[PDB]
Each structure stands twice: as structure tokens, then as C-alpha cells.
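Contributing new complexes? Match this layout with DAN.
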Amino acid sequence: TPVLEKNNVTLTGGGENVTKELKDKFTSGDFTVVIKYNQSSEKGLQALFGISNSKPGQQNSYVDVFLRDNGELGMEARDTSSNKNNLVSRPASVWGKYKQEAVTNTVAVVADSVKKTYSLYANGTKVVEKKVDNFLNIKDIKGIDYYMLGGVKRAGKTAFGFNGTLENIKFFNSALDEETVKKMTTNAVTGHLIYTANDTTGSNYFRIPVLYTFSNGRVFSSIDARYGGTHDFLNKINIATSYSDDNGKTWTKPKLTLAFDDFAPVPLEWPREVGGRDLQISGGATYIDSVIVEKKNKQVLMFADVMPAGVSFREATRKDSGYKQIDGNYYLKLRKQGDTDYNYTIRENGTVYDDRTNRPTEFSVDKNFGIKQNGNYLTVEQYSVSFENKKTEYRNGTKVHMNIFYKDALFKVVPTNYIAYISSNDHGESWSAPTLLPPIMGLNRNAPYLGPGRGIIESSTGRILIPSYTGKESAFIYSDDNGASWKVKVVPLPSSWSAEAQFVELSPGVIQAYMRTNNGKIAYLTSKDAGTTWSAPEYLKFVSNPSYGTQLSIINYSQLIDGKKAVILSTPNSTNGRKHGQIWIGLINDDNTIDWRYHHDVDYSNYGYSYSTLTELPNHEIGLMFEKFDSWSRNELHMKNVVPYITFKIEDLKKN
Ligand SMILES: CC(=O)N[C@H]1[C@H]([C@H](O)[C@H](O)CO)OC(C(=O)O)=C[C@@H]1O
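Output block (do not edit by hand):
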């Protein structure tokens, strides 16, 4: 039970002395503090409480828990005379505002001198636990004489003044156990996660959210389940899905939808320290960056990039499709172990052919790229990962089918990237086996890289359009036969853009592709013939981002706003990083120019905001899922439970 509990303490920098209440309560020196608070101003460094030596010369002798204006939660524990200075923290731990209101967060700190660890919790998640060599509890700091809410008394002055309301604050004179404190910090923020660390997927990490609303009124999500931290590469990544049959209120437990099993779907504690965060899973095959579209006949497509083990955006040969042309048909090449050339193709029924003799072999390749010999599966041992800061990838005794995308395969595909698609006839309950896309860029070129989010059906032609990019060009993958066959329009860009794009239709036959660039701006290209030819790029005047850029989301909206047809855009908007998420409403004019009339800031401007996805809910509200952190920063790698789902009414989005 609490040694002290206070409530509804509103403050604006000044703090409140509780020295009389807490002096003499902390017998061992260990402590737990749980704080339910909301901020009225996020600016500056703010302490939720402070325990200090207030006397002159002793300003580096204190304990506190602090909040930064970018959502970082941390704690310090410092002693002047021994020059001991502990700082434990994690970025992107709290929420600032939501729809014009200060957000209530619940955070906690645990100091355990037996373990020599400081632990921090926020909103149901243990955001960090750190064993420290120079551990300090309250009794270890010389001359503690001052205990304060909403600041730290340093040399008789109030430092780090907190602005807001401490709704409830509990001080305990012992280290409370992990599961209790997780429970105490659980609140409404906790329930905005669809995908959670070590849920049904087995993944501790997630990135690249996608939302889509189907014609039947189901709302559907896909996401990258990234098992080896959040690294784009190298990594072990599956695509997970989850859906809602009630306008987004409740969601199904996540299922794996695209996955390889050369590594198992298991939780790994990826090291965040500078010395380990660069580590990667190197040996594992991957699906990455999903795109969803619903056809006119209500069948659903999902596309994803496919990386064989060892291959990424970085390693993939750019000069080979992985396909061969034989009598006007395209067939995937394979290289057998011990050969240097690619002497084999996969042809009809998955039969592996020796191209030299033009004869079928005894080998075949199944619908999931698994290898058979005489109609029986070849096997390989699955890998596990183990730590200590010593990472090892090792064979674990479990047998899985040998696969042409694996490290230990007898027959291997060219080490480049591919695109695969799967189809569903039951709005995402079940999915067909993956089909690899044919060499639409040419035989001597790797496939493009998907622009995550959604594709579209252009209404005047029924053309299906899937966005992708090469690093130098936009690659608009399309089908004019309701998805039976695919072509591409390649459009050279002004520079080396990572041209992650999304489409909107302005009017029949007129589409725009809005995309990331390498120049700091969002570009948009216009076609007035349903995607066949594209104008020169124009740029939005009101977004200004770092040169590297970030993925965006833009969707058509079904209902009139101010009597006009509308589009809705989600993007970060800050030259300081992947920060300052905004939702913009653009109203289409009769001449097909857009009036960008409204914008809404999702949280405060220094809070993290990376990849995002929008959908129109059946009730005509808006669903938003996004990466509430900076996914470019090397400081914000390998963080759990940082991809929330939130919703807006149009009237909410009109404000800011
Ligand atoms: C296929 C792949 O690697 N996709 C990744 C993409 C890509 O590497 C970049 O476009 C190269 O320029 O980068 C990012 C990113 O947050 O910046 C996320 C994607 O998951």
C-alpha cells in the first residue's frame, strides 16, 4: 500500500512540497511511484515529482521522473559528492493531446537495489528496464531533505516545473513487481493497439500499418510483424492481419497471413543499446510492405515484397529479374547447390526442369515455394536466435519444408527482390497461395518495391493500379483484365526518390499519385487517361520534411465536405525528423485543382509520427493507424507498442 497518495493536483510550474509527508517513509531506499497525469503544456523538460537535496552546492543530488516535449519518459538518479549520474529513459513513451484534449497517461518508476535496476512503465507497457553499475536509491543520495510534486528543488529553486494535473500519484517504499505495475498503468491509451508485443503473432515489434474498408462494411488491417527489432533489413518479417466487424471498436486477434518458417514466429528482446541495436537477423526470408485493394467483384488482393534470406533493398542485384524466357513464357530460375550458373527453371505444375537438357527433373516446387523430390518434401532445420551482448543464429532441431527462398535450399532463386500477391474471396478470412509477379520491368531488372497502403480501381476504365518504385522511377503496376494479368508504366523521376506512393481519383479518368521524394517535399503526378501517361511532378506547398522523406497516406472520401468531393491526406510535417503528423482535407474544384482547406495536428509538433494509413469507416468517420515514433532515427529502434489506431469525425479534422 501507498506511503502517500494525492489527487487532482493542478500545477503550472510551481510544484507542491510534500516533504513532511514523505521524509522518514523510505526505510530501505527502494521505491515505486505511479503517476496518472495529463499535461496542459508539453514544452520544456518537466518532472512529475522530485526527491532532492535542496541545499546550495547539492543541485546534482536528486531523483526524478521526467517528460520531454517529444513524448520521452525518463528518470534521473544523481548524487553530487560521488559524481554518480544515472539516466534511464525511452522515446515515444507517452501521448500529449488527442482531439483538442490533454491525454491522460499513467506512468511509473521502480528502483530495485537488489537487482540494481530502474524500470519505467507507460500506459500498460514496460518501456525500459536497465541494470546499472552505479545504482542509487533514495538512501544512497547524501542529505535528501526535500520531496516535491511537479518539480525538483535544486539550490532552493524549483527546477523542471510540471504544467498540468497530477490526477493521482502513489508513492511506495518498495519495488513493486512487474505485472502489478503494468496493471496499474493500464488505461484508455492501452486499448488503441490492434497489434501488441508478443501477441498471437509472436512478434515484439511492428511497422508499416495498412487500413482498408471493404464493401461489406468490414474494416481490415495488415502490418509488418518484424521479429528481429524494427530494422527494414536484414530482418525476419511476416505480414499479419486483423479486422473489425463493428466500425473499428473491436478487432480480431492477429493472424499470420504471409510468412516463411525458416525462423519461427517467436518473441526476441532486441537490444536498444548503442552497442547492440545495429545487430540484425541475417539468415531469414521475408515478406515486407503490404498493399491492399478490393476488386469490383468483391475479391480482395494483397501484394507484398518478397526477400530471400540474405537479400534486402540494399543487397538485391538490380540487373536480374530472377526469370528466364523460354518459347515466349516466363519461368522463375533456380541455381542448384554447387553450380555457379542458373541451370533450372520452374515450369508447368511446379516441375523443375534442367534447362540444359530441356527435360523435367524429379524435383518440384509447391504453391508456397516449398521443394519436393519425387513428390515428397525436402526438409531443412529451422533457426532460432539467442543473446548474452552476444547474438547467435543456430539450428534448433525442428524440420520445416525446404524452400527456394531459404539460406539452406538445394535450389535457390536469384538473390533479388520479388513481388507476390494473394487473393481472398471471403473478405480476408482466408487467402489463396502466393503468386509471384512476372518480370514486368524486364528480364534484366529486379522487380520494383511496393508503395505501402492501398491500390485503387479507377472508375472510368475499371483499371487496377498498384503503386511501386525503383529508387529512380515510379512503377505503376496495373491490370486491364480485372487482375488476371499485369503490366507496368515506368515513369522516370527528377531524382533518386524512394517514391512510395498512393493514388486518388479526382474525376473519371483523372488520377493523381502523391509520393515521397529526396528533396524534402511531397510530389504529385497527374494522369488524365487513367494512368497511361503522367504529367511532370508538382509539389505540395504546405508540407516540409527532411530530405529522406516518409511514406504518406491519401484516400478518396465518399461524402461531400462543404458541398465538394474530398480527399484526406496523412503525413508527418517537420524538417526536424519524422514528427508532427497532420491530417489534411483537400476539396476538389470543378477544374480538378484541390483546395487544401483544413488541417489537423494529431499530437504536439515534436512528437513522433512516421508511416501512416487512413481509411473511411462504414459510418463515414476516419480510421488512422500510424507509427507514433520516429522510424528513421537510430535512437528510436526496437520499441514495443508504438503503433496505435485512432479515429476522427470530419468535424474533429476541421480543427487546427
Ligand atoms: C522494401 C523496404 O526495404 N522498405 C522500407 C523502405 C525502403 O528501404 C526505402 O524506401 C529505401 O529508400 O524504407 C522504410 C522507411 O521507414 O524509411 C520502410 C520500408 O519498410
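Reviewers usually confirm one structural detail per submission. For this one: DSSP finds three helices and 51 strands in the chain.
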